[PDB]
Symmetry: C4
Subunit: 91 residues, 4 copies
């Protein structure tokens, strides 16, 4: 499914960008920069916030650039992950 494949690529690239930004601008460990990027775009939310104005502006834009992509990917992923169980419970 190229639709799923493209959504995966777009999501990974968006999370990489966030990991680079927050690890370099906000001084987070890579794993913490990735964690912050993930909980932000999935809307789970973080227990910290950017300390720099640059980081605050980036996060606002990052949310609007990425929230729709991330939930499109979550939805397509959910279809692929659950379908084997549905098919085994049907055919």
């Amino acid at each position: 499914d190229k639709e799923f494949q493209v959504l995966f690529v777009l999501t990974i690239l968006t999370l990489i960008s966030g990991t680079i930004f927050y690890s370099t601008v906000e001084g987070l460990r890579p794993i913490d920069a990735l964690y912050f990027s993930v909980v932000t775009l999935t809307t789970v939310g973080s227990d910290i916030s950017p300390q720099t104005d640059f980081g605050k502006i980036f996060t606002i834009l990052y949310i609007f650039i990425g929230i729709g992509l991330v939930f499109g990917f979550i939805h397509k992923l959910a279809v692929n992950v659950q379908l084997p169980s549905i098919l085994s419970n049907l055919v």
Copy 2:
């Protein structure tokens, strides 16, 4: 039982929440009830007041979120249309 997709989504949600309860209690040292609370608020995107402390917990939670949100919200949508909406309509009928 009538909706097989709903039954699959229910069981997978239950299994997902069990897995999180075991994980956070073992790896992050939470009481089982607090591990379950964390799993639920995380996968509903409510979010908790706490966060994972270990790198293992952080990596797991990222994967848990991406696989978990889709299944929990699939279950929630099915619960709304298959159980809650018919119950409300039934309870609005004059008798």
Copy 3:
């Protein structure tokens, strides 16, 4: 619109139940109990958590009982709030 009216009633009653529960079981001021109930069911999320096991169990169930209702109401409210602006920008 009775559909909007029913969703409003259901939402208000659900938030009242939460306000009573968290103000009595978790010892919160009414406004804080309401605030907790709102940010939970809208998935904005709280910076606190229930301290009692009873309150933790209630919150888990409260989320599953109320999240679908609350977003149905948010959606119907959004249609009613934006439609005057759309109609003024059309007719």
Copy 4:
């Protein structure tokens, strides 16, 4: 401009975010940038690490959430289908 609903949702979102920035900076004492950040993460349901301290702020935020989420996510959906999705498709064309 082509989608009039999209234009309405854009302007209302901008006005909503301006209102929150003014409110939280005045009533909760936040810097304007921090007030805007709070408004955005609140209305996208991401959530912040902080919360309103005053009863006025708590009451406003409840009303802001219910009116705001619907408009911001309406704008986000329109932005996805009208701007981002066509841009991605265009950028996938071999040339």
